[PDB]
Amino acid sequence: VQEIDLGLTCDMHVHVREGAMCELVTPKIRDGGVSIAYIMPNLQPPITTLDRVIEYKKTLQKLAPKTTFLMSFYLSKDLTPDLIHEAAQQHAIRGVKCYPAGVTTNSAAGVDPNDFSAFYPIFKAMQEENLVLNLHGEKPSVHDGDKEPIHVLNAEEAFLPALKKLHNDFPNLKIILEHCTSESAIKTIEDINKNVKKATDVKVAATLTAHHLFLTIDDWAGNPVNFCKPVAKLPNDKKALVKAAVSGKPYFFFGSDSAPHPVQNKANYEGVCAGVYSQSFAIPYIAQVFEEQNALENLKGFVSDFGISFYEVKDSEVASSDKAILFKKEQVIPQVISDGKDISIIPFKAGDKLSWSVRWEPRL
Template sequence: MTVRIEFARPDDWHVHLRDDEMLAAVVDHSARWFRKALVMPNLTPPITSAAQAVAYRERILAAVTVDAPHFDPVMSLYLTADLSPAEVTRAWNEGAICSIKFYPAGATTNSDAGGTSLLQFAPVLETMASLGVPLLVHAESTDPALDIFDREAAFLVDEVAPVLERMPELSVTVEHISTSTGIDMVRQFDQAYGSITPHHLTCDRSDILANGLRPELYCKPVINSAEHRKALAAAALSGDPKFFLGTDSAPHPLSAKEARVAKAGIFNAPYALEVVAELFHEHDALDRFEAFVSGNGAARYGVEPSTDRLVMERTEPAVAPVDTLETAAGDVVRLFGVAEAALWSISLL
């Protein structure tokens, strides 16, 4: 019997769409099936004002070439020392943003404008708490003395927990959770939520290192141990409304991914749904797939799920999935999830 699932058009609550030729090359892959796309603001220079967010959203929509009237990018401002409570208030009241994003300075791609400590931004955080603006946190210590696999947990304990304790009105999404510490912290605090990526759900560090080095699996926070992968998968598969899909799709040219010093980021928007569906199928949990990709995140951000319905069937598509794309500038980008994409087809009901 064919395995078939029907679900509300999903949302991607964490995606990097870039700009210029890369934006043009990748945006259709988010627009085709996703409704909301929470677009990260770490451009160069970063998105730090309502006007910049509105202009970036217009560039994104102008770059879409597939028929996607459903596609609705929602924006975030980059939390920098220059971001004032007044600008946050203006951006929120104008409806230009759905959130503010914190990056530890230097932790990942284009994060130099970020901060070292969350509480250095206390005045802005207090404004956000009073307005109801969600804070999105890239939780990763930049202490060079700490082992790379311990940096998420350290940041959560040292930086995120004190903010959650001090500001119970501030709602926080721990982005791309990569450890059981993140899962536990989200469960511990009422106002905390967690996005989880397809790659952290299905890969662990042995996949990166055991059979030859696979730079395509290098991302921040780094994919951690099998034990952590299982904790993440258990949280997603449980249907717990605090956890939802954020792909963290982050395209880089192969010249940057397979360089002597490789950039962090995995381009998974094209096949994210197939990767997640295959995980839920393997664990006999397809009845909770819709909650993870369409329901939980919408509820967290205060919107109704889409009224569009999609269908996925586990039948080998007639055409083998492509494994790379090329930008107008000639850059090649590798796609994550090709094996799963070969097992599933997606259509609009």
């Protein structure tokens, strides 16, 4: 069928930017089909204060008034358990995002996942205030010639033990294994969620991006535009990610990980910035996967329903109650997304065609 009403769409993994790069991307949340988003904190400096996250939401509300924004804090060595509480009652944040040290862009100020003990007073504060824990699951690279060599392939699988220890020590804490990329990570989410069903018994969930449903290792090997973290893994891994996405289970929903960089950052011969931009056509990308699997009925759950049930998004928090209408008009993906002065992005599947577009329609 065409003209599917998805309602209030949820993209609970969003990197927009600061600056003029932010003025170009923040409207594209509306134009990508997303109504409710989740802004990540990895900036320069990292968002670790109450004043910064309030003015960062103050700016995004001006650039996109109709978009509903949920902010986050950077898990760093400057956070305090009293800051977590003071930011919670003020309703200035919606969760915390953890970056391992030196695994992605702006993650140098991150943490060491081998010893999470220093950040247990912080996680105890989130469990009381009912916040969300975002986990970029990837152990740092270890050659070492002695212990299990960690690389970009087995980085997510090696993080799974740390995920089960964080779930065991904080059973009530809502934790998300963002951007699952392997099959071992999927079976772990299937394992922790043994017999939980309906919508809200899920305490540990996982978000699946738009590019990880398409990309394999053969794609970004010579194409730095597709290179992101965690890297796209084998087809056997992509097989599980597609099945888990069209699964219709409540512990899987949509987090795009749209990380826009200028094209001069990708066109490097080393030190290429990882990230894939898919914000301008966020929902259209997912509609093509759900049509290939003939599972267009689960598109409402994965994109809209499950992201609202986990974060418990309320009707009073929504900025503009406009529903997303997914109509089937073919569109071409431009070769470049430019702001007109100096910024240039290469969107995901730049040049390819899509089966779907998306407009907006108000609740009457």
